[PDB]
Amino acid sequence: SLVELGKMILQETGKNPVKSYGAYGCNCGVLGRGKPKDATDRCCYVHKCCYKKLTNCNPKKDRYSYDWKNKTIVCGEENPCLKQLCECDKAVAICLRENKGTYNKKRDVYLKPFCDKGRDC
Amino acid sequence: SLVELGKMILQETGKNPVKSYGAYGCNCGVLGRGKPKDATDRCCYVHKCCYKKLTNCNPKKDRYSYDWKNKTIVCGEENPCLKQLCECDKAVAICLRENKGTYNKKRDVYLKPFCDKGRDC
């Protein structure tokens, strides 16, 4: 859920996940997918397609455990669905950190007027 | 939708809805419910119980029309679902305005600093 995902983003990027990625581009936050605007948007695109392959758990509400060892997200053993979900969340947190260099404040809202329909995952 | 809900909260409270309420307490913003920490937190708890009654529409995605008359939110006539959704969104904006005097900036973060399981809607 967002408790784990938002914490990972905070730990990797240092940014408020709700205010910085709650509605970034066409793919970051809620409101689904779309053709990505930038590298940051592409990370969230990757992420939501990771989520869609998961069907035995609920990424929105299911909780899971992980720990922070040597400043690295270490996913715990849960079951396979929850461990797969942990890995999706870890991947996007690292991705967003690596593309902070091109984060653009221009694209942080909720109407999505220019977002095109995304291709199938 | 999210657009109308955020616009209402801005019009009533004068605050940035995402920065001020995107993660306030246990019930404001971020998905999930819990024992409210104060009155502002309780406004969002009632709001999420309001949403759960609705099945014929999507609260997050479905747009509805409302108006601003005599500095008052006035819901348009929509269908019964969208009308009830507008009235839920209107009540949460008014409630947050009413309880601004006890707004506690110790409480606007998303990890759910640790909330107890909420009572049933």
PDB file of C-alpha atoms in Angstrom:
ATOM      1  CA  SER A   1       0.000   0.000   0.000  1.00  0.00           C
ATOM      2  CA  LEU A   2       0.983   3.671   0.026  1.00  0.00           C
ATOM      3  CA  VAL A   3       2.344   3.291   3.569  1.00  0.00           C
ATOM      4  CA  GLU A   4       5.179   1.129   2.228  1.00  0.00           C
ATOM      5  CA  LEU A   5       5.434   2.714  -1.228  1.00  0.00           C
ATOM      6  CA  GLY A   6       5.362   6.288   0.046  1.00  0.00           C
ATOM      7  CA  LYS A   7       7.952   5.393   2.673  1.00  0.00           C
ATOM      8  CA  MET A   8      10.280   3.892   0.060  1.00  0.00           C
ATOM      9  CA  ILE A   9       9.982   7.015  -2.103  1.00  0.00           C
ATOM     10  CA  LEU A  10      10.728   9.184   0.939  1.00  0.00           C
ATOM     11  CA  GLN A  11      13.729   7.034   1.839  1.00  0.00           C
ATOM     12  CA  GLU A  12      15.195   7.008  -1.681  1.00  0.00           C
ATOM     13  CA  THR A  13      14.349  10.505  -2.956  1.00  0.00           C
ATOM     14  CA  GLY A  14      13.794  12.539   0.219  1.00  0.00           C
ATOM     15  CA  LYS A  15      10.616  14.034  -1.275  1.00  0.00           C
ATOM     16  CA  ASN A  16       7.057  14.055   0.054  1.00  0.00           C
ATOM     17  CA  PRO A  17       5.512  11.253  -2.046  1.00  0.00           C
ATOM     18  CA  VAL A  18       1.976  12.665  -1.849  1.00  0.00           C
ATOM     19  CA  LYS A  19       2.877  16.230  -2.822  1.00  0.00           C
ATOM     20  CA  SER A  20       5.682  15.406  -5.278  1.00  0.00           C
ATOM     21  CA  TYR A  21       4.276  12.288  -7.004  1.00  0.00           C
ATOM     22  CA  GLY A  22       0.565  12.325  -6.156  1.00  0.00           C
ATOM     23  CA  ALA A  23      -0.213  13.664  -9.632  1.00  0.00           C
ATOM     24  CA  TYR A  24       2.985  13.914 -11.695  1.00  0.00           C
ATOM     25  CA  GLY A  25       2.731  13.614 -15.465  1.00  0.00           C
ATOM     26  CA  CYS A  26       0.487  10.896 -16.859  1.00  0.00           C
ATOM     27  CA  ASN A  27       1.539   7.923 -14.696  1.00  0.00           C
ATOM     28  CA  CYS A  28       2.672   9.081 -11.224  1.00  0.00           C
ATOM     29  CA  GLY A  29       0.045   8.913  -8.491  1.00  0.00           C
ATOM     30  CA  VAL A  30      -3.497   7.657  -8.985  1.00  0.00           C
ATOM     31  CA  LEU A  31      -5.705   8.005 -12.092  1.00  0.00           C
ATOM     32  CA  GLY A  32      -3.908   5.271 -14.005  1.00  0.00           C
ATOM     33  CA  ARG A  33      -1.515   5.285 -16.936  1.00  0.00           C
ATOM     34  CA  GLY A  34      -0.729   7.242 -20.079  1.00  0.00           C
ATOM     35  CA  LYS A  35       2.075   7.867 -22.510  1.00  0.00           C
ATOM     36  CA  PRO A  36       4.943   9.135 -20.319  1.00  0.00           C
ATOM     37  CA  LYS A  37       6.075  12.754 -20.523  1.00  0.00           C
ATOM     38  CA  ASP A  38       9.600  12.387 -19.123  1.00  0.00           C
ATOM     39  CA  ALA A  39      11.943   9.955 -17.396  1.00  0.00           C
ATOM     40  CA  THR A  40      10.221  10.430 -14.031  1.00  0.00           C
ATOM     41  CA  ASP A  41       6.860   9.695 -15.676  1.00  0.00           C
ATOM     42  CA  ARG A  42       8.396   6.616 -17.308  1.00  0.00           C
ATOM     43  CA  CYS A  43       9.381   5.175 -13.921  1.00  0.00           C
ATOM     44  CA  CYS A  44       5.760   5.399 -12.769  1.00  0.00           C
ATOM     45  CA  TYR A  45       4.686   3.846 -16.085  1.00  0.00           C
ATOM     46  CA  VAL A  46       6.979   0.868 -15.436  1.00  0.00           C
ATOM     47  CA  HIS A  47       5.573   0.713 -11.910  1.00  0.00           C
ATOM     48  CA  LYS A  48       1.875   0.576 -12.789  1.00  0.00           C
ATOM     49  CA  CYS A  49       2.541  -2.180 -15.330  1.00  0.00           C
ATOM     50  CA  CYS A  50       4.328  -4.082 -12.544  1.00  0.00           C
ATOM     51  CA  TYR A  51       1.182  -3.695 -10.423  1.00  0.00           C
ATOM     52  CA  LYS A  52      -1.097  -4.964 -13.190  1.00  0.00           C
ATOM     53  CA  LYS A  53       0.655  -8.345 -13.375  1.00  0.00           C
ATOM     54  CA  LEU A  54      -0.201  -8.816  -9.682  1.00  0.00           C
ATOM     55  CA  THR A  55      -3.642 -10.351  -9.140  1.00  0.00           C
ATOM     56  CA  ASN A  56      -3.341 -12.508  -5.985  1.00  0.00           C
ATOM     57  CA  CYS A  57      -2.862  -9.439  -3.760  1.00  0.00           C
ATOM     58  CA  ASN A  58      -4.138  -5.848  -3.702  1.00  0.00           C
ATOM     59  CA  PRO A  59      -1.355  -3.255  -4.140  1.00  0.00           C
ATOM     60  CA  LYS A  60      -3.687  -0.481  -2.952  1.00  0.00           C
ATOM     61  CA  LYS A  61      -4.530  -1.895   0.481  1.00  0.00           C
ATOM     62  CA  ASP A  62      -2.235  -4.834   1.271  1.00  0.00           C
ATOM     63  CA  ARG A  63       0.554  -4.224   3.770  1.00  0.00           C
ATOM     64  CA  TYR A  64       3.949  -5.913   3.783  1.00  0.00           C
ATOM     65  CA  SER A  65       7.244  -5.642   5.621  1.00  0.00           C
ATOM     66  CA  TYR A  66      10.719  -4.553   4.584  1.00  0.00           C
ATOM     67  CA  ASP A  67      13.732  -3.052   6.300  1.00  0.00           C
ATOM     68  CA  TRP A  68      16.404  -0.427   5.699  1.00  0.00           C
ATOM     69  CA  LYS A  69      19.886  -1.982   5.885  1.00  0.00           C
ATOM     70  CA  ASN A  70      22.995  -0.073   4.782  1.00  0.00           C
ATOM     71  CA  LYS A  71      20.665   2.562   3.305  1.00  0.00           C
ATOM     72  CA  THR A  72      19.057   0.003   0.991  1.00  0.00           C
ATOM     73  CA  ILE A  73      15.466  -1.228   0.816  1.00  0.00           C
ATOM     74  CA  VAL A  74      15.518  -4.944   1.670  1.00  0.00           C
ATOM     75  CA  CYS A  75      12.225  -6.648   0.927  1.00  0.00           C
ATOM     76  CA  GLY A  76      11.229  -9.232   3.471  1.00  0.00           C
ATOM     77  CA  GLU A  77       9.918 -12.690   2.839  1.00  0.00           C
ATOM     78  CA  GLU A  78       6.134 -12.359   2.805  1.00  0.00           C
ATOM     79  CA  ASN A  79       4.445 -14.656   0.270  1.00  0.00           C
ATOM     80  CA  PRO A  80       5.227 -14.404  -3.490  1.00  0.00           C
ATOM     81  CA  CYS A  81       2.547 -11.821  -4.331  1.00  0.00           C
ATOM     82  CA  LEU A  82       3.536  -9.490  -1.497  1.00  0.00           C
ATOM     83  CA  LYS A  83       7.245 -10.005  -2.205  1.00  0.00           C
ATOM     84  CA  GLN A  84       6.638  -9.260  -5.891  1.00  0.00           C
ATOM     85  CA  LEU A  85       4.763  -6.107  -4.861  1.00  0.00           C
ATOM     86  CA  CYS A  86       7.571  -5.026  -2.527  1.00  0.00           C
ATOM     87  CA  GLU A  87       9.983  -5.372  -5.456  1.00  0.00           C
ATOM     88  CA  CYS A  88       7.789  -3.208  -7.709  1.00  0.00           C
ATOM     89  CA  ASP A  89       7.683  -0.508  -5.029  1.00  0.00           C
ATOM     90  CA  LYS A  90      11.446  -0.712  -4.452  1.00  0.00           C
ATOM     91  CA  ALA A  91      12.156  -0.442  -8.185  1.00  0.00           C
ATOM     92  CA  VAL A  92      10.105   2.726  -8.664  1.00  0.00           C
ATOM     93  CA  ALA A  93      11.572   4.418  -5.574  1.00  0.00           C
ATOM     94  CA  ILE A  94      15.105   3.907  -6.905  1.00  0.00           C
ATOM     95  CA  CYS A  95      14.046   4.963 -10.419  1.00  0.00           C
ATOM     96  CA  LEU A  96      12.545   8.244  -9.202  1.00  0.00           C
ATOM     97  CA  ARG A  97      15.712   8.987  -7.221  1.00  0.00           C
ATOM     98  CA  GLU A  98      17.853   8.435 -10.314  1.00  0.00           C
ATOM     99  CA  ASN A  99      15.738  10.805 -12.426  1.00  0.00           C
ATOM    100  CA  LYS A 100      15.547  13.657  -9.919  1.00  0.00           C
ATOM    101  CA  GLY A 101      17.951  15.496 -12.218  1.00  0.00           C
ATOM    102  CA  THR A 102      15.116  16.028 -14.711  1.00  0.00           C
ATOM    103  CA  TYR A 103      12.082  16.276 -12.401  1.00  0.00           C
ATOM    104  CA  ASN A 104       9.959  19.097 -13.839  1.00  0.00           C
ATOM    105  CA  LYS A 105       7.590  21.069 -11.597  1.00  0.00           C
ATOM    106  CA  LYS A 106       5.484  21.815 -14.684  1.00  0.00           C
ATOM    107  CA  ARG A 107       3.417  18.611 -14.418  1.00  0.00           C
ATOM    108  CA  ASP A 108       1.912  18.125 -10.945  1.00  0.00           C
ATOM    109  CA  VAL A 109      -1.890  18.064 -11.328  1.00  0.00           C
ATOM    110  CA  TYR A 110      -5.097  16.171 -11.775  1.00  0.00           C
ATOM    111  CA  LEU A 111      -6.930  17.029 -15.015  1.00  0.00           C
ATOM    112  CA  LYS A 112      -4.455  15.327 -17.396  1.00  0.00           C
ATOM    113  CA  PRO A 113      -5.599  17.339 -20.447  1.00  0.00           C
ATOM    114  CA  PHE A 114      -2.761  16.272 -22.785  1.00  0.00           C
ATOM    115  CA  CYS A 115      -2.227  12.658 -21.698  1.00  0.00           C
ATOM    116  CA  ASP A 116      -2.621  10.159 -24.527  1.00  0.00           C
ATOM    117  CA  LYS A 117      -4.041   6.671 -24.122  1.00  0.00           C
ATOM    118  CA  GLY A 118      -1.284   4.313 -23.044  1.00  0.00           C
ATOM    119  CA  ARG A 119      -0.339   1.137 -24.842  1.00  0.00           C
ATOM    120  CA  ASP A 120      -1.046  -2.244 -23.278  1.00  0.00           C
ATOM    121  CA  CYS A 121       1.480  -3.605 -20.796  1.00  0.00           C
TER     122      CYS A 121
ATOM    123  CA  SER B   1     -14.005  13.514  -8.890  1.00  0.00           C
ATOM    124  CA  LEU B   2     -10.703  14.464  -7.272  1.00  0.00           C
ATOM    125  CA  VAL B   3     -10.829  17.749  -9.207  1.00  0.00           C
ATOM    126  CA  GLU B   4     -14.163  18.830  -7.724  1.00  0.00           C
ATOM    127  CA  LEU B   5     -13.259  17.610  -4.227  1.00  0.00           C
ATOM    128  CA  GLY B   6      -9.997  19.557  -4.147  1.00  0.00           C
ATOM    129  CA  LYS B   7     -11.630  22.650  -5.633  1.00  0.00           C
ATOM    130  CA  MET B   8     -14.319  22.613  -2.929  1.00  0.00           C
ATOM    131  CA  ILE B   9     -11.788  22.299  -0.095  1.00  0.00           C
ATOM    132  CA  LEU B  10      -9.840  25.232  -1.533  1.00  0.00           C
ATOM    133  CA  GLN B  11     -12.971  27.380  -1.806  1.00  0.00           C
ATOM    134  CA  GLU B  12     -14.096  26.664   1.759  1.00  0.00           C
ATOM    135  CA  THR B  13     -10.789  26.574   3.653  1.00  0.00           C
ATOM    136  CA  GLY B  14      -8.555  28.685   1.420  1.00  0.00           C
ATOM    137  CA  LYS B  15      -5.829  26.045   1.787  1.00  0.00           C
ATOM    138  CA  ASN B  16      -3.977  23.948  -0.766  1.00  0.00           C
ATOM    139  CA  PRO B  17      -6.019  20.727  -0.436  1.00  0.00           C
ATOM    140  CA  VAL B  18      -3.137  18.365  -1.229  1.00  0.00           C
ATOM    141  CA  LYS B  19      -0.491  20.117   0.878  1.00  0.00           C
ATOM    142  CA  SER B  20      -2.846  20.655   3.833  1.00  0.00           C
ATOM    143  CA  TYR B  21      -5.040  17.532   3.726  1.00  0.00           C
ATOM    144  CA  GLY B  22      -3.377  15.039   1.366  1.00  0.00           C
ATOM    145  CA  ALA B  23      -2.050  13.121   4.383  1.00  0.00           C
ATOM    146  CA  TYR B  24      -3.561  14.721   7.503  1.00  0.00           C
ATOM    147  CA  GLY B  25      -3.989  12.289  10.382  1.00  0.00           C
ATOM    148  CA  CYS B  26      -5.498   8.856   9.812  1.00  0.00           C
ATOM    149  CA  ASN B  27      -8.341   9.678   7.405  1.00  0.00           C
ATOM    150  CA  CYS B  28      -7.533  12.751   5.265  1.00  0.00           C
ATOM    151  CA  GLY B  29      -6.225  12.132   1.761  1.00  0.00           C
ATOM    152  CA  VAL B  30      -4.200   8.899   1.567  1.00  0.00           C
ATOM    153  CA  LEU B  31      -6.386   5.788   1.236  1.00  0.00           C
ATOM    154  CA  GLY B  32      -7.551   4.203   4.464  1.00  0.00           C
ATOM    155  CA  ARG B  33      -9.500   4.883   7.648  1.00  0.00           C
ATOM    156  CA  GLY B  34      -8.593   4.918  11.320  1.00  0.00           C
ATOM    157  CA  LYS B  35      -9.488   6.315  14.706  1.00  0.00           C
ATOM    158  CA  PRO B  36      -9.562  10.098  14.109  1.00  0.00           C
ATOM    159  CA  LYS B  37      -6.926  12.121  15.946  1.00  0.00           C
ATOM    160  CA  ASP B  38      -8.975  15.343  16.104  1.00  0.00           C
ATOM    161  CA  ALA B  39     -12.005  17.065  14.579  1.00  0.00           C
ATOM    162  CA  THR B  40     -10.311  17.763  11.228  1.00  0.00           C
ATOM    163  CA  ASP B  41      -9.342  14.087  11.040  1.00  0.00           C
ATOM    164  CA  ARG B  42     -12.955  13.184  11.848  1.00  0.00           C
ATOM    165  CA  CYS B  43     -14.309  15.251   8.939  1.00  0.00           C
ATOM    166  CA  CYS B  44     -12.347  13.036   6.543  1.00  0.00           C
ATOM    167  CA  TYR B  45     -13.473   9.884   8.376  1.00  0.00           C
ATOM    168  CA  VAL B  46     -17.143  10.786   7.875  1.00  0.00           C
ATOM    169  CA  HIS B  47     -16.265  11.636   4.265  1.00  0.00           C
ATOM    170  CA  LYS B  48     -14.812   8.194   3.559  1.00  0.00           C
ATOM    171  CA  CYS B  49     -17.845   6.535   5.142  1.00  0.00           C
ATOM    172  CA  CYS B  50     -19.944   8.747   2.851  1.00  0.00           C
ATOM    173  CA  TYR B  51     -18.093   7.410  -0.209  1.00  0.00           C
ATOM    174  CA  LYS B  52     -18.507   3.762   0.807  1.00  0.00           C
ATOM    175  CA  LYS B  53     -22.310   4.007   0.538  1.00  0.00           C
ATOM    176  CA  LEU B  54     -22.003   4.779  -3.189  1.00  0.00           C
ATOM    177  CA  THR B  55     -21.809   1.972  -5.746  1.00  0.00           C
ATOM    178  CA  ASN B  56     -23.324   3.384  -8.960  1.00  0.00           C
ATOM    179  CA  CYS B  57     -20.465   5.815  -9.682  1.00  0.00           C
ATOM    180  CA  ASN B  58     -16.707   6.170  -9.271  1.00  0.00           C
ATOM    181  CA  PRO B  59     -15.938   8.870  -6.665  1.00  0.00           C
ATOM    182  CA  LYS B  60     -12.318   9.351  -7.744  1.00  0.00           C
ATOM    183  CA  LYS B  61     -12.878   9.597 -11.513  1.00  0.00           C
ATOM    184  CA  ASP B  62     -16.446  10.716 -12.277  1.00  0.00           C
ATOM    185  CA  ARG B  63     -16.914  14.446 -12.852  1.00  0.00           C
ATOM    186  CA  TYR B  64     -19.984  16.334 -11.655  1.00  0.00           C
ATOM    187  CA  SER B  65     -21.170  19.928 -11.975  1.00  0.00           C
ATOM    188  CA  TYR B  66     -21.606  22.336  -9.077  1.00  0.00           C
ATOM    189  CA  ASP B  67     -21.713  26.099  -8.698  1.00  0.00           C
ATOM    190  CA  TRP B  68     -20.667  28.918  -6.356  1.00  0.00           C
ATOM    191  CA  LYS B  69     -23.645  31.095  -5.373  1.00  0.00           C
ATOM    192  CA  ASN B  70     -23.645  33.521  -2.430  1.00  0.00           C
ATOM    193  CA  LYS B  71     -20.236  32.137  -1.418  1.00  0.00           C
ATOM    194  CA  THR B  72     -21.876  28.726  -1.048  1.00  0.00           C
ATOM    195  CA  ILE B  73     -21.228  25.399  -2.735  1.00  0.00           C
ATOM    196  CA  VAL B  74     -24.457  24.422  -4.498  1.00  0.00           C
ATOM    197  CA  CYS B  75     -24.593  20.954  -6.071  1.00  0.00           C
ATOM    198  CA  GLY B  76     -26.206  20.734  -9.459  1.00  0.00           C
ATOM    199  CA  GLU B  77     -28.918  18.242 -10.206  1.00  0.00           C
ATOM    200  CA  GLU B  78     -27.007  15.240 -11.559  1.00  0.00           C
ATOM    201  CA  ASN B  79     -28.100  11.619 -11.169  1.00  0.00           C
ATOM    202  CA  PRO B  80     -28.706  10.208  -7.638  1.00  0.00           C
ATOM    203  CA  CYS B  81     -25.147   8.839  -7.420  1.00  0.00           C
ATOM    204  CA  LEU B  82     -23.314  11.948  -8.641  1.00  0.00           C
ATOM    205  CA  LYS B  83     -25.665  14.114  -6.563  1.00  0.00           C
ATOM    206  CA  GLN B  84     -24.857  12.137  -3.412  1.00  0.00           C
ATOM    207  CA  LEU B  85     -21.164  12.295  -4.326  1.00  0.00           C
ATOM    208  CA  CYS B  86     -21.371  16.083  -4.646  1.00  0.00           C
ATOM    209  CA  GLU B  87     -23.080  16.321  -1.260  1.00  0.00           C
ATOM    210  CA  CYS B  88     -20.367  14.171   0.330  1.00  0.00           C
ATOM    211  CA  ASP B  89     -17.654  16.401  -1.156  1.00  0.00           C
ATOM    212  CA  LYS B  90     -19.520  19.540  -0.107  1.00  0.00           C
ATOM    213  CA  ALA B  91     -19.865  18.376   3.503  1.00  0.00           C
ATOM    214  CA  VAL B  92     -16.172  17.516   3.845  1.00  0.00           C
ATOM    215  CA  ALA B  93     -15.125  20.958   2.587  1.00  0.00           C
ATOM    216  CA  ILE B  94     -17.471  22.709   5.029  1.00  0.00           C
ATOM    217  CA  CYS B  95     -16.328  20.515   7.931  1.00  0.00           C
ATOM    218  CA  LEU B  96     -12.640  21.231   7.285  1.00  0.00           C
ATOM    219  CA  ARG B  97     -13.396  24.961   7.236  1.00  0.00           C
ATOM    220  CA  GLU B  98     -15.319  24.654  10.510  1.00  0.00           C
ATOM    221  CA  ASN B  99     -12.409  22.954  12.301  1.00  0.00           C
ATOM    222  CA  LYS B 100      -9.526  25.090  11.018  1.00  0.00           C
ATOM    223  CA  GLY B 101      -9.137  26.554  14.508  1.00  0.00           C
ATOM    224  CA  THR B 102      -7.783  23.236  15.801  1.00  0.00           C
ATOM    225  CA  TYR B 103      -5.741  22.330  12.711  1.00  0.00           C
ATOM    226  CA  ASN B 104      -2.612  20.611  14.042  1.00  0.00           C
ATOM    227  CA  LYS B 105       0.377  20.709  11.683  1.00  0.00           C
ATOM    228  CA  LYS B 106       1.882  17.839  13.691  1.00  0.00           C
ATOM    229  CA  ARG B 107      -0.472  15.557  11.739  1.00  0.00           C
ATOM    230  CA  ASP B 108      -0.098  16.028   7.955  1.00  0.00           C
ATOM    231  CA  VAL B 109       2.003  12.963   6.974  1.00  0.00           C
ATOM    232  CA  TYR B 110       1.193   9.768   5.063  1.00  0.00           C
ATOM    233  CA  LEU B 111       2.967   6.882   6.826  1.00  0.00           C
ATOM    234  CA  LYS B 112      -0.028   6.806   9.185  1.00  0.00           C
ATOM    235  CA  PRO B 113       1.955   7.673  12.328  1.00  0.00           C
ATOM    236  CA  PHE B 114       0.464   4.997  14.121  1.00  0.00           C
ATOM    237  CA  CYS B 115      -3.309   4.999  13.807  1.00  0.00           C
ATOM    238  CA  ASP B 116      -5.662   2.538  15.444  1.00  0.00           C
ATOM    239  CA  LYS B 117      -8.255   0.559  13.515  1.00  0.00           C
ATOM    240  CA  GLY B 118     -11.272   2.740  12.864  1.00  0.00           C
ATOM    241  CA  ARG B 119     -14.790   2.046  13.987  1.00  0.00           C
ATOM    242  CA  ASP B 120     -17.228   0.671  11.443  1.00  0.00           C
ATOM    243  CA  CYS B 121     -18.969   3.053   9.058  1.00  0.00           C
TER     244      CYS B 121
END
